[PDB]
Design a protein around this ligand. Sequence first.
Ligand SMILES: [Ca+2]
Ligand SMILES: [Ca+2]
Length: 314
Amino acid sequence: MEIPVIEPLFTKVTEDIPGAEGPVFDKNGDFYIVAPEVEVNGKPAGEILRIDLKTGKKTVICKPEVNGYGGIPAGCQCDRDANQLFVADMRLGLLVVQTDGTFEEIAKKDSEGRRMQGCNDCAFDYEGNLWITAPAGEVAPADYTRSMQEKFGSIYCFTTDGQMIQVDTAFQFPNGIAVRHMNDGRPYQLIVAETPTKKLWSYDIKGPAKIENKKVWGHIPGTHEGGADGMDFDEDNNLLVANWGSSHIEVFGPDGGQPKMRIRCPFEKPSNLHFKPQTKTIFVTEHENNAVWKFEWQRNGKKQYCETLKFGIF
Ligand SMILES: [Ca+2]
Ligand SMILES: [Ca+2]
């Protein structure tokens, strides 16, 4: 159109990853994907994989389980001060995963003593606070439920001082999440996808675990089943959003509203995305083929927290 559509070349990266999700680079430039929807005997047995970008070969580094309850690991962020992954898990809540495949479960309960909810995606701000979507109901051992039909999905902030703070509730499947920063580095806006309602929500970030000014920020095209899944900013603060079921990734300008551009994908179900540091390359997971691809965007990605320096000067 208007809405203008681009059709970049998609190159295959790897295949056969059930529910392929949470693409992420670590501080060494290794690449990881999660496979939330792997099952064994009809029960969750989701996986965290390292992908060799040269070969497409997959290695399962972690198949998390707590007390026999398998995980549904669905979204990732790399830490800054240690080379470890924070992983949102729909059964287990928030995990911290090492490169050696060992892991720890961070919260059974929130800061107010409520049972933790299962999580789907997360985003670090540059202050090191981790903003997390929680579209599942209570974590294992509670029977699994998810908010695709009913409004019981929540949002958390896991803070630098170790608090797991519930910051909003009553979403119908909160999904992707991203933080906008001022040019100086200050976090100031949180964006949250609400998948089936075809909305992106915004908040003003007033401080760690302090959000206000909830607003319907963006509108996701289409009336397909699905909607916005994963998201990330480019270096100009355009927000790229996988629109699962639509065959497109939407591109929002800084001010939201309607997409300014769409990216046609050669598949119906883009799920999540991530830039390779220092490049224009976006890795995309998708659920039509349960596979991972890459394509070239117009500019580099916005730096993730793990690309910033604790002891930087400028
Ligand atoms: Ca997701
Ligand atoms: Ca991402």
